[PDB]
Point group: D2
């Protein structure tokens, strides 16, 4: 009757669909992380408080615009808002800070059929027109070929190369050209640096400001990830790198990118300029699938609730897009203009919360858990076996939660990859771990502030009890419900090995 | 290499997803019918011809607006445009006509005597709803007239009232005998004759009004192919529509529009009484919480697939294309997922009726649907449809499932089905073959209504019946071969499946090469 | 390259079959319990020691014949043989004692043998004057249970007839002897659940501390309850295995199973009572339902029959044993092969060898998947712990699942999910250690160490005992990973803790 | 309520097992071919007629024993019995003839000069093996002659020697001295096995050459080639059979370890396989035979080539009128494994109850065929199937799919060579496959395939080919009705082609029985 448990019991996916029930209410817990882009509409300490109450887990700062002093003040406000709830550790919600890079860029009426010359000659830097268009990408001729397409201004204008310091092009799709418009080269192996000079300064500032994760723009190959990793350096070795896949080469070389990264963003805006817009859903489902197979976080981004920039309710296509991203297996969903500049930032966050929670209940865990196991390698790793054991146990007794003690987050990540229905309450004393855990579907991170007990086994038990208080206080479960608890046999990371089925006290 | 065949071979759905390939191009054939609402943007014969070339299969006329004179003209234009292609029978594409009823709608009056005028409603402000027809054309930010005379009897203090696609929100503060005082929750621009929803309330308007009766009888006279019946709440609503159509309209398909909570609750009895369903997501997402609409959509599509009845996904699929030359990523996703869900048809409303980019909207649904169709995990879908399908003594059902199985085995260019009533082709469609189903019929209505079924590409044979039956079969089969080749569905040397009768009941399947 | 691991990884059952490899050697462990009927050929202390070394887990006493004095001595010899290994508790193997009842029977009278019409009489005048014209039976209600056309088999199905008197026509003739057993196919035989001899024998069973009763000719749930009632409070811990021997028992199987501790597929009599070509259907149905319920099932009768006379079995016999294991049978049985035959030890060794090969050839991927899907979602902690342990054991290919258990129940719960890894059930309860052999995969070990003062140390001591057994038996070695199940306090019913532990 | 259809619809194999119902009766048709070894007990025309009525589909002649005169007469009698039913083509059942070769056998000599004399060996005693032909007819308790001249080069000290179905066990210039490790009665000309030794006898001996020539002369349908070790053995037999025997099917018998190791290349080269478990279970440990059996049946099912399960399936019925429970189980499980045919050897050749043994195999096969889990079986066959543009394969799979959908009474297939019907059998339909042919050899050889009920149409060819096609289809209808496979009003599937000649099957119809 609740959380689509009738549908959960269907022996086929078709029958599962047939039983989905709008009058079967979901549980309180919402598993999918919500990433909110902060800007003029959401920047104030007072609005940030409401953003957190509405369900924001990660504050994204877009470094395509704004000064370091500007972003430093946004981060300060985020932390002011976040720590205003710190007095009660039971109810405190960690909030992560994400730095999203500008990344490499190419920058500059026009009738269809007309001929346009692209010039790299610096003489035309401030004198672009209907006949000659200057671009700042010096190696463009080396990466394009006759018949190559060139997009200008967020894909509005389309050119085709006819002759390859210059390129003779024919206007395929025409419109009003302007100053400093963005250029995309579909199918081209663009050889711009992994990080611009601006990016290097921005990433170092990210380390200064103690950010949790970096969303690295325009990642094309594993060596781009390694360059971002190198810039973050020893000091930033624990900041998660999320590679943004934005073009054809990124999609083609996705496997090597995933391996080198901590996670992925499906950057649908630019991806739908670089490849045909009708193919974007294929790229999204492929990347979410492969991330799910690897146990690495994946974010669905861009235009998910776009109309809510101007309207208090989303379109039906937007509601569908959010639900389907969750059903695809996205760990996180994202809001951009909707929260950064729109008239309804709080409504947009609340709607993502509501849809995600409904969608999580409609998941067909029977088949999903079955397939994840089948494709899960047999390894000698004790934590992996303990984690799969915990998820299986959680299904067998419909547990209220899986409670996991973790220093680095890894033990909770290993549970998350198996996609339990039960929320995963990850108890840590490491504040960064608490914040970074929002990247993983199902993890509800809690930061334990209690002193270390003198008997280590008592300290373990204290943290488990803290998780029990959190679940009760947040309405995930009640006294007498059964929960799964994951602990280790000695202190320090890498020793999670104990799964217990326990009553909520 | 093509049609996502690498993903097709995966032994798990997760691996199927992992194998989806942006460099694997789809086939030329598009299986999902595209329904276009016709209006000022898309009504001239000139533009209708381009609508057809762009992929329109069904012309939807919304009888919430317009006179019978006007709609008769629209229907004439659709037929003129459709028949302009008749002189090359190989390239002719049947086009269906659908009548969408007004039904039990609630509408506001005119802002200050104008059709275009608007007033700003400010959150927390007061707004009086009146039933007095003196204010019927004198609506403003203070007084709002609506045409539901009994609204007071079905609302209470605290009730919420939604106006203009649920974007303006009011709360009843005080009730009256012939009036309501409300407070604005969600403000915005209020225009003329906007739709009103009372989600809490049991609205007591007739399922089929006197106007609906007039429109349905006009539908019969005009030889429409189908009726989209608005606001269906229960089986008896459908029976009333069916009664008005009567014996003369008995072959017109009734598609029940599900757009309120009762329609969802009573879905099974509605589906049983109907020929098909529309998931009318606009009103549905106001009548129930917007976050639950995807559940109702997937439930209804699943139940229709299971029953073998056409289902249409409708409303705001490509909404931003009313004003913009391309869609948002959420809109792209929505179209693809509707197809992956199992929708037989997808629909465009304002995008084609009134927007700046009607042809572009049609082309985009065409491009997305074709990509989505290739990305279907047929291995599991076909297995489940066969499993959930009763094993019966019906020879035509057995031939149909055999033909679909055969099409998978040789990855055929098509399943060609010779059919008078369309039934044989519908029976093939319900098993969801990858191969396009070329349904060859001499019956014009059969050809038009076939568009309701995923995969059916209807072709109308106009040649006389041959004396020799084998030669008449071969004439129709070769007709399908020539359409398929012309449309690029397949080439000489490819293998196709052909379904016919054996003697002058479809029960013969042949595996034949394309000449 | 070992344990059919290549076939284990196949995505389909067909590919699994195709990868089965006679050159892929099995692990040391053999999961399927071997039940041996004891008799003249295997009754001595010295032969019993070799029977244990050859793989006997349960000694079966057939009470159809033999005195209490006789069976008392057999039991004494079993115990002497079993306890001769008790000095080393790391290598000691528990051996269970099973009492198989004579049960309710229909018998003919004394002749005057005799080689067409034939009248059945209940008239005690014909009691010692049986012949070709008149045959007396001791089942007074036979006329209430049969009808015109109903078949009647005499002497282990050898003779066949078609029907306070009955007039019958001989369908299949033969030599009709004295005091022969009679079967009534399809008939609802209303003989008591427990005969007068059974009552005395079951009392004897309780006095002799037997581990389990194989109750003959169980037709309905109430028959089980009557056996349970006769065993009483003194015998409350004695397991009752219902023998399904006829059509009614098959029809009413679900109710019998619910009331029983386990099931024996008694194929000999079953194949007289129903057409012999249908027995495999009944076997597979009963094994399936028992697996679904997680209750032990034994496959019985003629599994290695030719080995009564010969030192190697027929190919059909090799096949039958393997297929019983592949079907899901917890135990396999030997009757005449070990009781009276010329090659008792060879017969035990052959069941061991075949069982071990067959267990490796199980398609655990699908088996476990199906057991999970059909696994009821309940609030029970021990059930959730058990399935979590089995899932973990597959994920890390563990050397074993170690289970501390007082009653055996915790280990039974693991066994029903059919892990590949051996289940080392460590107990201090000697009877639990003996009874655990009824369950596939359970390797029971009897810990004899004193209860340590600190319970947590006592728990660790027993886990370490299991580690030592596994090392000595070659199940695993230092550094391997095993699964360990324990509870949150002393006493039964509190198993709730699964650990992945390195072997020290 | 019949044919285990309730168990058929189970969503899991476990639930499928749970639903198996002893009160759910099978259909009339029995799909698994029954091969009967003919000998003194079953050789007469009289008995052979009853063997046919009881279900014999193939008569096997074992050329390990008997002269050509003897076998020629057996063959003559098989044909006399078979053709006694030819007057009504509707009821005529084709019977195939199989020649089973001696191959590279090792046999002992005569006990005290007689073929039926025996000496009871005692466990523990000593026994000398000699190659000196002086003793080839004077074997006894103390000296034993063997016919494997080159025996001494291929075995060493401590080697194990097995005699008479591995039942007697022994441990080691032209002799060997041994101690009886397992004793018992020692008879004449018993088979000897050297499991740990590389026996070097020819694939095709002079005797085998003579026998194969005889097989061609006698128009046998198939050869069962003994002790095939590798693909080159199969090619040798194929080449000896040559052009005159080109249409004789070669079934390779797997009876040793090398045969199992090299099974894939053997299968590729053969028309089918026999799992010859008798010797197989001596050459490799007896406990591993089920693994070898299931592997071979699986791989044959995968490749679409006939597989036969052989030896001791109902062994006790040589002396008893009823089989043991292990025997009943073995037959059922061979069918559930996927074996196309099951075999009787001593049970029919020399035993006291040949007809009872044939009847019992018939009863068990039919029960087991209903108990198959077609849902998974068919799904896996479709998935494992190599995907092709072949129209004949598409028509075959569509026909099988259709047969399940309407629980058809039969699949009727017109075929000249048998191939079209073989293509249907490959996908393992529940419905029987009535294969209508005018080719008598096709009719006989079709018995190698699970499900094929071959019928021999003897009507003249009609001028109008379409009417010739409809003629044979209606013959099939008449056969099915007469055999009680279906009645008027039932739905059946019918496969035909678009033109005459082999390779054009492309038409599937779902038709009611007239």
């Amino acid at each position: 009757q609740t959380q689509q448990l009738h549908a959960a019991m269907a022996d086929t996916f078709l029958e599962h669909m047939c039983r989905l029930d709008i009058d079967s209410p979901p549980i309180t817990a919402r598993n999918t992380g919500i990433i909110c882009t902060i800007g003029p509409a959401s920047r104030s300490v007072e609005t940030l408080k409401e953003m957190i109450k509405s369900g924001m887990n990660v504050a994204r700062l877009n470094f395509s615009h704004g000064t370091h002093e500007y972003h430093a003040e946004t981060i300060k406000n985020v932390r002011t808002a976040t720590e205003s709830f710190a007095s009660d550790p039971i109810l405190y919600r960690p909030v992560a800070v994400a730095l999203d890079t500008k990344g490499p860029e190419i920058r500059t009426e026009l009738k269809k059929g007309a001929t346009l010359k692209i010039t790299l000659d610096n003489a035309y830097m401030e004198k672009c027109d209907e006949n000659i268009l200057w671009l700042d990408y010096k190696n463009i001729c080396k990466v394009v070929e006759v018949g190559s397409k060139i997009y200008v201004d967020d894909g509005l204008i389309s050119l085709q190369v006819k002759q390859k310091d210059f390129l003779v092009t024919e206007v395929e799709n025409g419109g009003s050209l302007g100053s400093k418009k963005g250029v995309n080269l579909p199918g081209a192996a663009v050889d711009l640096p992994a990080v611009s000079e601006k990016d290097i300064q921005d990433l170092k500032f990210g380390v200064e400001q103690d950010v949790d994760m970096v969303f690295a723009s325009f990642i094309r190959k594993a060596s781009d990830v390694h360059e971002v990793r190198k810039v973050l350096g020893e000091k930033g070795k624990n900041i998660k790198i999320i590679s943004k896949i934005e073009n054809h080469e990124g999609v083609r070389r996705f496997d090597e990118i995933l391996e080198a990264s901590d996670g992925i963003m499906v950057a649908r805006g630019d991806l739908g300029i670089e490849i045909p817009a009708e193919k974007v859903f294929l790229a999204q489902k492929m990347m979410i699938g492969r991330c799910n197979r690897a146990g690495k976080p994946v974010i669905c981004a861009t235009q998910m609730l776009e109309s809510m920039i101007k309207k208090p309710r989303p379109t039906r296509a937007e509601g569908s897009d959010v639900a389907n991203a969750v059903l695809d297996g996205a760990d996180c969903i994202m809001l951009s203009g909707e929260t950064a500049k729109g008239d309804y930032p709080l409504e947009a966050v609340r709607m993502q919360h509501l849809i995600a929670r409904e969608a999580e209940a409609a998941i067909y865990h029977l088949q999903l858990f079955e397939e994840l196991r089948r494709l899960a390698p047999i390894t000698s790793d004790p934590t992996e076996a303990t984690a799969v054991g915990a998820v299986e146990a959680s299904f067998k007794c419909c547990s209220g939660a899986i409670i996991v003690l973790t220093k680095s987050g890894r033990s909770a990540h290993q549970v998350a990859r198996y996609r339990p229905r039960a929320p995963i309450i990850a108890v840590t004393r490491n504040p960064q771990t608490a914040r970074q855990a929002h990247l993983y579907r199902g993890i509800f991170p809690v930061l334990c502030k209690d002193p270390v007990q003198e008997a280590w086994a008592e300290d373990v038990d204290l943290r488990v009890n803290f998780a029990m208080n959190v679940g009760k206080a947040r309405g995930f479960f009640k006294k007498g419900d059964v929960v799964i608890v994951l602990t280790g046999w000695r202190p320090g990371s890498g020793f999670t090995n104990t799964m217990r089925v326990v009553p909520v006290p």
